[PDB]
């Protein structure tokens, strides 16, 4: 079908540790990943789904695979106690997307930020105009607690969808600990 | 301090620089060998000791000039002796 490669960026940063968000923050975002990979998988079989993180240690917990049971096993006891480092998140995402088996596939990333970020907006506008020079559409979905009215993320997606791009979105977090599947019910319907 | 010319001292000199008597310096230096900070031999009749290996110490940016100078002509010793090998042993293997 359509050539893309679904790459989720999970959130094992320290601001996702409690269980105020219903069952578990980890389980809410985990099952969100499960049903969106049922959506992308059952919509297009030509998609391998791997999981990377934006913490202090941006480990490839799952090498880019077309199975999600390994994603289940790693997201179980995923240990979300770590300092967020989002500035290397763009490099650890897009460089891995340059590692892919097909660059004919469309570069599609989703990123999960349920944490206050300590980036420079100059840095994410350098990486943001880099993605303007790299043609990547990312819908960043926000979780947890955060710097509310998400700081530098509106500027980031604003400096991402520009120059006739206009297809990327920023799903900011609604700060009520509800079931996150209805929170992510918009990009699964339209990105 | 003593160079590799001699590095051989006497118990009179130990009794001068440590001002400790003649019948204690042997126990002192045997204690030093038992600890193993120094490695040497003991002669009694000539009252001298052939100290060979010392515990290594630290130094500033000034002694590296002296080690630089001792490195320096040691380079051209290898150059000078090797040039006989290259020059004379040339016709054996081109």
């Amino acid at each position: 079908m359509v050539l893309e490669s679904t790459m989720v960026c999970v959130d094992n940063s320290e601001y996702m540790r409690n269980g105020d968000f219903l069952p578990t923050r980890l389980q809410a975002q985990q099952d969100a990943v499960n049903i969106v990979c049922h959506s992308k998988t059952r919509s297009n079989p030509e998609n391998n789904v791997g999981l990377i993180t934006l913490a202090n240690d941006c480990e490839v917990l799952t090498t880019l695979t077309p199975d999600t049971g390994r994603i289940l096993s790693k997201l179980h006891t995923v240990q979300p106690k770590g300092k967020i480092t989002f500035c290397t998140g763009i490099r650890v995402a897009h460089l891995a997307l340059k590692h892919r088996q097909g660059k004919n596939h469309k570069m599609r990333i989703i990123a999960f930020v349920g944490s206050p970020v300590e980036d420079n907006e100059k840095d994410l506008v350098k990486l943001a105009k880099r993605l303007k020079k790299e043609k990547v559409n990312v819908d960043i979905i926000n979780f947890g607690e955060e710097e509310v009215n998400t700081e530098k993320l509106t500027a980031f997606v604003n400096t991402l969808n520009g120059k006739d791009g206009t297809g990327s979105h920023l799903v900011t977090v609604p700060p009520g600990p509800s079931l996150a599947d209805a929170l992510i019910s918009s990009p699964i319907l339209a990105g | 301090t003593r160079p590799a010319n001699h590095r051989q001292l006497t118990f009179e000199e130990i009794a001068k620089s440590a001002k400790i008597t003649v019948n204690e310096v042997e126990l002192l230096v045997m204690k030093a060998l038992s600890v193993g900070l120094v490695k040497g031999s003991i002669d009694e009749v000539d009252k001298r000791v052939h100290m060979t290996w010392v515990q290594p110490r630290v130094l500033d940016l000034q002694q590296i000039k002296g080690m630089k100078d001792r490195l320096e002509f040691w380079c051209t010793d290898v150059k000078s002796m090797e040039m006989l090998v290259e020059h004379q042993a040339h016709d054996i293997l081109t």
Partner: protein, 286 residues
């Protein structure tokens, strides 16, 4: 724990062909790959390898990637085609000890306990062996901190094999400095080894580049060993070093005189064997 390593020409070329098939990237790429082999009797062996896909950007140079699917599937295939062969460590193309190779080894230490690295050469020139292998060692000291996982070069050599010598020596057919008389010693070590001591002489001269201008660590752990060198300068030509030398040279040249004495008699006897072949052939044939 590890004594020394054994490196084969098969893996030695097997880095280079992969360097050629990534040679179209031009700009910058290190050839990181998985090193395969065994070790027996604490003697490290390397027999086979492959190369993992790897990219790395210069800005924020701590972002590395190893496709562990490419690790597990291809190593499963290599275990399947050879259960004797297994993992032994890793390698990278190694010009000048890249920085991510402090945690590549930590990234894949869960496969091999002594997950060894190998630095190779792609632009082959030296007066020695352009083959290198470190080892991961961590030792907290009284002049730093805890995490002290530095790398220590275990000694290395190119090992041979009766399988590979036939095809390799077929792959030369070019030049071969055999007929070992004295000349092989005279040239592989009396010419070559002195220039081997040239570079090790020159390396501490390159370190001596810190007198007032070089980097910040001054001495601490560099000067006990050099202090042991200049401590370990040998004995001068006065004491008894002359006498036993003239003694044993005075014994060696005896045996040399005997062998040179007999050799001329051998050739003389052969000349008699040739003049009998002359004088009883000129009249007989005519």
């Amino acid at each position: 724990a590890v004594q020394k390593v054994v490196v084969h020409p098969l893996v030695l070329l097997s880095v280079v062909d992969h360097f050629n098939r990534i040679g179209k990237v031009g700009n910058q790429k290190r050839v990181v790959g998985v090193l395969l082999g065994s070790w027996q009797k604490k003697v490290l062996d390397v027999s086979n390898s492959f190369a993992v896909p790897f990219d790395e950007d210069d800005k924020d140079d701590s972002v590395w990637f190893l496709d562990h699917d490419y690790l597990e599937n291809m190593y499963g295939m290599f275990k399947k085609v050879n259960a004797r062969e297994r993992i032994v460590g890793w390698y990278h193309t190694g010009p000048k000890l890249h920085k991510n190779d402090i945690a590549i080894n930590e990234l894949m230490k869960r496969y091999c306990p002594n997950s060894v690295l190998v630095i190779i050469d792609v632009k082959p020139k030296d007066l020695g062996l352009p083959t290198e292998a470190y080892i991961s060692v961590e030792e907290v000291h009284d002049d730093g901190t805890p995490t002290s996982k530095t790398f220590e070069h275990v000694t290395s050599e190119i090992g041979a094999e009766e399988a590979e010598e036939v095809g390799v020596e077929h792959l030369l057919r070019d030049i071969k400095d055999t007929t070992v008389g004295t000349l092989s010693q005279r040239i592989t070590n009396q010419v070559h080894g002195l220039k081997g001591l040239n570079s090790k002489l020159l390396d501490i001269r390159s370190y001596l580049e810190k007198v007032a201008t070089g980097k910040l660590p001054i001495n601490h752990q560099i000067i006990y060993q050099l202090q042991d060198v200049f401590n370990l300068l040998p004995d001068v030509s006065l004491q008894e070093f002359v006498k036993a030398f003239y003694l044993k040279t005075n014994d060696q040249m005896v045996v040399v005189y005997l062998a040179s004495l007999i050799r001329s008699v051998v050739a003389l006897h052969n000349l008699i064997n040739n003049k009998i072949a002359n004088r009883d052939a000129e009249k007989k044939e005519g």
